[PDB]
Design a protein around this nucleic acid. Structure first.
Ligand SMILES: Nc1ncnc2c1ncn2[C@@H]1O[C@H](COP(=O)(O)OP(=O)(O)O)[C@@H](O)[C@H]1O
Ligand code: BEF
Ligand SMILES: [Mg+2]
Lengths: 575, 93, 98, 87, 107, 95, 86, 107, 93
DNA sequence: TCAGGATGTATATATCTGACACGTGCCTGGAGACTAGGGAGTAATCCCCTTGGCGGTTAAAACGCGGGGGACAGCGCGTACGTGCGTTTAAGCGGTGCTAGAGCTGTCTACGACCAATTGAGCGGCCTCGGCACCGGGATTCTCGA
DNA sequence: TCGAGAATCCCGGTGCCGAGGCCGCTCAATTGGTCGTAGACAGCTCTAGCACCGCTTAAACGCACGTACGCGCTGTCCCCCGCGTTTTAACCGCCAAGGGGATTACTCCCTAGTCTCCAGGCACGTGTCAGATATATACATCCTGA
């Protein structure tokens, strides 16, 4: 069929490797493995994952070939990049110039690991004023350095400055920022300079839609950049389940496996450790006060009316009112910390419910948000709760991100919770000190949902992770949840097709056929409150003694010693 | 040769407004040149509206629009009322 | 004291500066939110081709510019150099815009 | 403020003091009085009410919900301010 | 085959037929709709009704039985609406609204 | 003897009351014929025409003096002056 | 059978008349220089209107200006005139 | 039966044919003369020749090779004739003639 | 769908005026909307001239007149020259 | 503030007459019946241009402080303007007589509207490089004090 | 009237993307007939325009005098500019979704015809009264004195 890809592109493997600069051999032809860490590494431990992946990517450089790292999360891409350059240029000693471009959330982090996890290879950063960037730009302008460290846009702005210099091996992080080649960053990189080597570090493959997997594999290697246009309706065929999935997904997806073997690299935590405390993934449900539910039924303010993107309007009122001054005006005239703040929604009511257990067992918590404003009312809500929290969000400031990181990493931290921004989640921190993670809202793409989802269980996690999603029943938001794991079925034939291919196994893929297909069939079965402390205690408390220490919380929320506002929003939202 | 005008019509409407009042010849001339004028404005607008959409046909809906462009405010509202009512009653029979 | 021009010289240096170039003098997003606001009242849920909003901006800036040339003529007429509200309300009263 | 925003100002305050002042500077005005600002917001808001009213009308006539460029060019072409360059 | 006039069917006093003739033979568009004459005639009726009504009122306030150009001048310039409509017009025999500026009157 | 300015007001009421044509005919008609000599020659005017020109022109000058008056009052003078007019025409855009 | 070649006839507009007009417009006290200026203004205006009228006339193969033609010239410049027809 | 374009016969650069089409299908009159397209096209050619010529001169005086809106603005507003023609027009990207009143300059 | 314009024509005339000069896209748009505009004015005038005389036919003589109404002064004289010459040369062959 | 008095303004009463409101005969433009066909209405379809929001940066906006320049208020002067009068004249109103041309009708006829055959002028996509933005550094100038 | 110093032009190098030149694909412009009609042109009236004159007088003109307003001046107080510093919202780059703006195909009924009557609306008389127009009377109103 496309077998000219197999034979022609294996001889073309010879072409890239030698000429340009069972696939386990010919593409990998130059072989080696070493368990002995590089001499520059200071104060570190070797698990086997960054070893196997280590000499696999290092093998790709010996093959003079690039790749993508598809691995899960928490696998320490930092350390693989450190062992990467420190080992390569511990050998070659050439040591430069080479640059990495990392998320603005993680910068002083990278500077930290570069501090304690290797002294010999130093770098240079870009932050703050164009004045400080003047000092280091003219200072080290002359090109005396080991490595360039930058961030996303400063390569665009500084591009005039730092583009005039030659490059060989470049590294990016959070590759899913790339996506389109028409996105400005990519095409700048192309016009920017030329480095013979590249890489992509990420926590997931491309979007469910997967048009741009073309673009990726353009940026990965010479392979497909000539013929790009044609394959669309063939490869998209995965997007008579036996016949449809059989012809479409089994034929072409098998094809792509046989293509995708020498690219992506991944495993799970149980592979490297088994220290993962549990599957540590659960959810819950809720219900919203009918006050605004009546508005969902009628929607005669919503449909023809100034309002717009009424879905976005929903997600705004799905979460919580007080987004608009009048809510507080005809509702809470003094905007003081007040009741019906927590009684308006189920997230705030059952959130009150989980509070005493929160502080009770003291296990810490992360709360994430898709949209900004909500964190404000949440902050006021903690201002009533009085148990302290950090507020982190995009664009807040520059280096107080780092300062807050320090405030967290202190083992004595009294404030248990604090807030992040999903879009800025982006590996923006490392957390070993907490267990519980709570997500809100919608997150139209799961890759970020799972992205923040995985911050909890971390290498060296001594706690046992519990996770819950806050969704209210009988609402558009659980509809979008539906659509979300619908896209878990979409990528289940894509990124669950792309994930398991590392050493090019044999029967594991049919293990995912039978057992995974039992999972998709299980949600086919699926398609076609907890107010009592008993339930929530059970799902949360991780041992019977934890169940017992929650009896001290039975003395208040259990023991314990409307329409007007909708006529106000109907008249005054009656425009 | 007969030179037509709107005289007698204006005169009727007058009699349905102020049964007493007479209207001097000069004033009748003015009201004449008026009605011709306003007519040219409206049919002008309806014309090049029929043009900007590349329709070939002046219809009621244009005339309604053009009337809503020329006449300020209240005259627009009432005039639209008069028109709509009149057309309706025209179609009834 | 630091080097300080007499009042009025910074002014002229501007006047040359701006009368030299063609730039749009009103920052976009304020203006676009302005237009959308004003259009809420007539019909609802309109969508503007960005080229349109550019059109309004260009017109309106040309109109206000004309208005200030004329007003300036009036203020100079009164032997003041400082345009004032009654100067404008005059100018619009003469053009016939009221 | 911090807790709840309540920082919504208004749209028409979007045109600012120094912006208006730049417009004058192009006009040739030398020294601007302090009251002119609220005034010129007045003028501007009228002018826009007119032009936009007409453009909206044209649009509703064609059954489009998209106010285009050709339409604003027509509204102005109608009030005598004819604009060039947009087609 | 009895005849009944389109004005009568309409309930209007302007000669719908005559309008239709003008719209055709003035080369406004190629094809004139069937409702357009009716609608337009209605409009013209309305406007003339306004100007005449106001005028008559004015003449009555001058105790004249008939309407003369001066009375059209006053009925048009006092009404602010029509003033906006007719603002470019020079009426014959017109005269002006009696108008005296503030500063001219003696102390 | 009245104080200066009272005869003025008494006029202003007088004229703003009536409709009469304010320019004696034959001067105006000879004016028009003169101006028309230059373009073509041996024209003949329907007297109704010459009446038309007279009515227009008088309405134009009347407007012009209302506006000029607004300017003179603006300057805190009561006496219209040439630069007042040349202003008014400069604002309307007639130059 | 003859045509006298005219001059200095704009003097036909006379200081008393212009004082009447100015009175109608609401002007209170006229300066003494307004007169020469006004004669300038008027002469401009009539120059335009009469050249357009004459144009229409030349077009129709007539030697005779007519009220219709003036009314069209005024409608043309943007000053509409009523009562004389058209 | 060899073909030759009416522009060529005319000696003009505007597409006489296209003009004739517009005059017919715009409903200006019922019947368009045969000379009218030619004559009109000639006129348009002349005017565009003027505006372009002046503009180009202006751009050359700014030592720019190409004509940009600013140069149309200046070529139109300096020429007094066109200024009289276009006086109601708002040119995009326009700018203004550099203008400073007498009294503003220092002594 | 093709949206026609006068671009290439303007460009030719340019090349017969300033052989060097290029003309930016925006300027070409302006000259376009210009020529369409002036065209609408002229054919407008010639239209309602053909109307006031109750002729049914736009001819050269109207266009000549309308041109003499719109264009001030010198533009009138020269433009009339261009036209007359062009028509003449048209009739010669 | 109060008054005499002249001045112009508005009030009541005959009268005069030409403009209007109406009645009649006449005839052309409207109305009604009938036919076709093409333009507009509506369904189907798809993709791009719009909208909404967030991150991240930095140039502009807001704030405020001082001080120099100008708006405004009053005063004094003298000259240009209004008012009243007596005198002159050109407008106005009415007649007369002439006739140039505005305006209509009766001929034909060049000529412009169609309609069918035919093809290249112009249009959209797509290369592809130089004019212009633009930075940077240098030199030259224009507005302030001592 | 000489320095300082903050703008502003100028030379040179860089890069980059928008003008411009090039090619194949149409459809709109030619050609070339025919045929119905506006209009071109001649021929007639008969009307309103021009020219002139004579007679009346309301208005325009020249002038004299008094006066109040235009205008220059000075002072004074305040408020808008210029500058620096802290803040924030615009701006450019992302991310997404979905909905109106496009097209195309098909149908159906509305309107342009066309022919046949026929009464509304127009020219033209005709009587009669609403508003000039004229005399006489009463009264507000401004000016100047007090
Ligand atoms: N060999 C190791 N020994 C101890 N901890 C490790 C090791 N490798 C990784 N980690 C843990 O991984 C974390 C850093 O992971 P990170 O580089 O952020 O992962 P990724 O880059 O894959 O998202 C550190 O907190 C560290 O505790
Ligand atoms: F960035 Be890894 F998830 F700690
Ligand atoms: Mg990473």
């Amino acid at each position: 069929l496309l077998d000219q890809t197999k034979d022609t592109r294996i001889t073309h493997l010879l072409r890239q490797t030698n000429a340009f600069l069972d696939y386990y051999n010919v593409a990998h032809r130059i072989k080696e493995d070493i368990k002995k860490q590089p001499s520059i590494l200071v104060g570190g431990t070797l698990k086997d994952y960054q070893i196997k992946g280590l000499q696999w990517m290092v093998s790709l450089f010996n093959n003079h070939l690039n790749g993508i790292l598809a691995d899960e999360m928490g696998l320490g891409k930092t350390i693989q990049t450190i062992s990467l350059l420190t080992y390569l240029y511990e050998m070659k000693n050439i040591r430069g110039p080479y640059l990495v471009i990392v998320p603005l959330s993680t910068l002083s982090n990278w500077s930290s690991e570069f501090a304690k996890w290797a002294p010999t290879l130093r770098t240079i950063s870009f932050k703050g004023s164009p004045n400080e960037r003047k000092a280091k730009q003219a200072k080290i302008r002359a090109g005396e350095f080991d490595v360039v460290l930058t961030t996303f846009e400063y390569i665009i702005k500084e591009r005039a400055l730092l583009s005039k210099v030659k490059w060989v091996h470049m590294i990016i992080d959070e590759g899913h920022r790339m996506k389109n080649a028409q996105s400005k960053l990519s095409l700048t990189l192309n016009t920017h300079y030329h480095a013979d080597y590249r890489l992509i570090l990420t926590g997931t493959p491309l979007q469910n839609n997967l048009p741009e997997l073309w673009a990726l594999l353009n940026f990965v290697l010479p392979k497909i950049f000539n013929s790009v246009k044609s394959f669309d309706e063939w490869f998209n065929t995965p997007f008579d389940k036996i016949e449809l999935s059989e012809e479409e997904t089994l034929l072409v997806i098998r094809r792509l496996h046989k293509v995708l073997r020498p690219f992506l690299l991944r495993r799970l935590k149980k592979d490297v450790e088994k220290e993962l405390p549990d599957k540590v993934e659960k959810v819950v449900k809720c219900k919203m006060s009918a006050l605004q539910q009546i508005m969902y039924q009628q929607m005669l303010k919503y449909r023809r009316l100034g309002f717009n993107n009424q879905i976005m309007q929903l997600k705004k009122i799905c979460n919580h009112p007080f987004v608009f001054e009048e809510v507080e005006d005809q509702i809470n005239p003094t905007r003081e910390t007040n009741d019906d703040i927590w009684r308006v929604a189920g997230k705030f009511e059952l959130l009150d419910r989980i509070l005493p257990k929160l502080k009770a067992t003291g296990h810490r918590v992360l709360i994430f948000f898709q949209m900004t404003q909500i964190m404000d009312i949440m902050e006021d809500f903690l201002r009533y709760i009085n148990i302290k929290y950090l507020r982190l969000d995009g664009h807040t400031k520059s280096d107080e991100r780092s300062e807050l990181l320090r405030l967290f990493n202190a083992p004595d931290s009294e404030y248990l919770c604090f807030i992040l921004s999903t879009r800025a989640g982006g590996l923006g921190l490392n957390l070993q000190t907490a267990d519980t993670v709570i997500i809100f809202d919608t997150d139209w793409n799961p890759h970020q949902d799972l992205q923040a989802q995985d911050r909890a269980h971390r290498i060296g996690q001594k706690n046992e992770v519990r996770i819950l999603r806050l969704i209210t029943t009988n609402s558009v938001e659980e509809v979008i949840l539906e659509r979300a794991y619908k896209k878990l079925d979409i990528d289940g034939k894509v990124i669950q097709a792309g994930k398991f291919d590392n050493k090019s196994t044999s029967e594991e893929q049919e293990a995912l056929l039978r057992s995974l297909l039992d999972a998709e069939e299980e949600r086919r079965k699926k398609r076609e409150e907890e107010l009592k402390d008993s339930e929530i205690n059970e799902i949360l408390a991780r041992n019977d003694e934890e169940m017992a220490v929650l009896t001290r919380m039975d003395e208040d929320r259990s023991k314990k010693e409307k329409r007007e506002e909708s006529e106000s929003a109907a008249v005054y939202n009656g425009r | 040769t007969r030179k037509e005008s709107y005289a007698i019509y204006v005169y009727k409407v007058l009699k349905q407004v102020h049964p007493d009042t007479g209207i001097s010849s000069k004033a009748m001339s003015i009201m004449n040149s008026f009605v011709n004028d306003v007519f040219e404005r409206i049919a002008g607008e309806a014309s090049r509206l029929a043009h900007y959409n590349k329709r070939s046909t002046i219809t009621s809906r244009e005339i309604q629009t053009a009337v809503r462009l020329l006449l300020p405010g209240e005259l627009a509202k009432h005039a639209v009322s008069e028109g709509t009512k009149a057309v309706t009653k025209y179609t009834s029979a | 004291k630091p080097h300080r021009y007499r009042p009025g010289t910074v002014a002229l240096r501007e006047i040359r500066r701006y009368q030299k170039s063609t730039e749009l003098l009103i920052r976009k997003l304020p203006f676009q939110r302005l237009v959308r606001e004003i259009a809420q009242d007539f019909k609802t849920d309109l969508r503007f081709q960005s080229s349109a909003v550019m059109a309004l901006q260009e017109a309106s800036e040309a109109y206000l510019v004309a208005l200030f040339e004329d007003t300036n003529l009036c203020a100079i007429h009164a032997k003041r150099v400082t345009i004032m509200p009654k100067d404008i309300q005059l100018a619009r009263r003469i053009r016939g815009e009221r | 403020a911090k807790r709840h925003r309540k920082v919504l100002r208004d749209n028409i305050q979007g045109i600012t003091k120094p912006a208006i002042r730049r417009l004058a500077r192009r006009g040739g005005v030398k020294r601007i009085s302090g009251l002119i600002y609220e005034e010129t917001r007045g003028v501007l808001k009228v002018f826009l009410e007119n032009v936009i009213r007409d453009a909206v009308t044209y649009t509703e006539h064609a059954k489009r919900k998209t106010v285009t460029a050709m339409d604003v060019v027509y509204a102005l072409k109608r009030q005598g301010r004819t604009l060039y360059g947009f087609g | 085959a009895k005849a009944k006039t389109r004005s009568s069917r309409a309930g209007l006093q302007f000669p719908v037929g005559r309008v239709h003739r003008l719209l055709r033979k003035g080369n406004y568009a190629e094809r004139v709709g069937a409702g357009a004459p009716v609608y337009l005639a209605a409009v013209l009726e309305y406007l003339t009704a306004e100007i005449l009504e106001l005028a008559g009122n004015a003449a009555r306030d001058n105790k004249k039985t008939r309407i003369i150009p001066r009375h059209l001048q006053l009925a048009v310039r006092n009404d602010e609406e029509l003033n906006k409509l007719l603002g470019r017009v020079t009426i014959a025999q017109g005269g002006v609204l009696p108008n005296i500026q503030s500063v001219l009157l003696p102390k």
